[PDB]
């Protein structure tokens with residue numbers, strides 16, 4: 001059994017604003033590698049909810065690889081361009097009934113772009 005395998009009825013997906021790097025520990029400033037003060041701001045608010053069991057980062061890169069894996073071949077015409085997908089956290093609720101509450105509080109976290117239940 002693996003951690004990234006969560007049942008449909010208890011999964012909430014939390015999409016991160018495209019200009020927030022919640023999973024990046026360091027960023028570039030003045031040519032140096034320095035602390036990202038916004039690191040895990042969204043992660044921690046989700047992890048602090050009493051009804052959530054796990055929160056796992058899913059990058060936009062990873063989401064596109066899996067899409068090409070599940071559907072046919074890569075989507076060649078977009079290969080030169082930026083990835084338009086959103087980084088996301090995959091949140092596991094403690095019970096199905098907690099999902100609607102989790103998704104509502106999640107949209108109120110600053111940095112959260114959208115939440116899918």
Ligand SMILES: CCCCCCCCCCCC[N+](C)(C)C
Nearest residue numbers: 064075078079080081082083084
């Ligand atoms: C409105 C929704 C339409 C969006 C469809 C876009 C498909 C994403 C392809 C990204 C490939 C870029 N690449 C190679 C760097 C990962």
